[PDB]
Write a protein that binds this ligand. Sequence first.
Ligand SMILES: Nc1nc2c(ncn2[C@@H]2O[C@H](COP(=O)(O)OP(=O)(O)O)[C@@H](O)[C@H]2O)c(=O)[nH]1
Length: 290
Amino acid sequence: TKERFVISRRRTGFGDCLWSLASAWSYAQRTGRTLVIDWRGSCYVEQPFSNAFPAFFEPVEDIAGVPVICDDRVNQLSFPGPFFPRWWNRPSIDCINRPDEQIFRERDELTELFQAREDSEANTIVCDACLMWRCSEEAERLIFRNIKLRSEIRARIDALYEEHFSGHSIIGVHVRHADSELALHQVCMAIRKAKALSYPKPVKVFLCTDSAQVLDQVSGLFPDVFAVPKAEMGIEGGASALIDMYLLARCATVIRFPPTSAFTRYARLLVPRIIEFDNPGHLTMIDNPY
Ligand SMILES: Nc1nc2c(ncn2[C@@H]2O[C@H](COP(=O)(O)OP(=O)(O)O)[C@@H](O)[C@H]2O)c(=O)[nH]1
């Protein structure tokens, strides 16, 4: 009997990476495989063969009973074939071309596998597609509770929490960016809706946006708006993303613009009230006690 594996490969934003990871974990758990977290080629890391996982999270060798490999051993180990999806059995020269259509086919093939009664006979499952929505919300919560941010990032979160969140009810606003005038108008309406709700503590607005113009505009339109200020630059970008993602999950209400963004998925799982645009033009509120 030989060790078998599920490899979770993802190189996009962390919301996507961590949700896709939960899907891979859940299959590994179901089928008695080792999970490999392979974030080589991450958008936040300049070096293309460095596993990005340990640049942001502490080493983990086990997640809820599933053995994990999450470090530079991905560059030393030969993960055994045959592989699934079957594209991964092709010669390397044939794997140079990996268009979106192949990636989307593999999403579908993995989805089918995950739903099937029988485990695959492949010794290694390679997950290198978006696996958002491909697991239970419980699997997603389990991931957030069983990996830990590096201490330098936690310390920043802890400082910001003490400075801004503590003693207050925070409305978190995620704005992922004639068109722009409307959209700013809609975000303003969402904030006004959120502010008209009752909170137990005095209200502040936490803005997370990837745009400078949005911060200046929203801050000029509402009181008590704050934000977290902004190779080495890739890692700082990643840290700043994680700080924002985690702090959003500590808000009393979160506004998701748009609610399709994985960035606010963690917040969506944890926060008591979520506001989003639905009937377009119209705002909906979700209660999540849970
Ligand atoms: N620091 C920071 N980065 C953001 C914010 N919104 C988006 N980003 C960056 O863009 C990436 C978005 O990808 P993901 O988290 O998968 O969310 P999605 O692409 O909007 O589904 C985030 O992980 C961040 O790296 C934000 O409010 N604050």
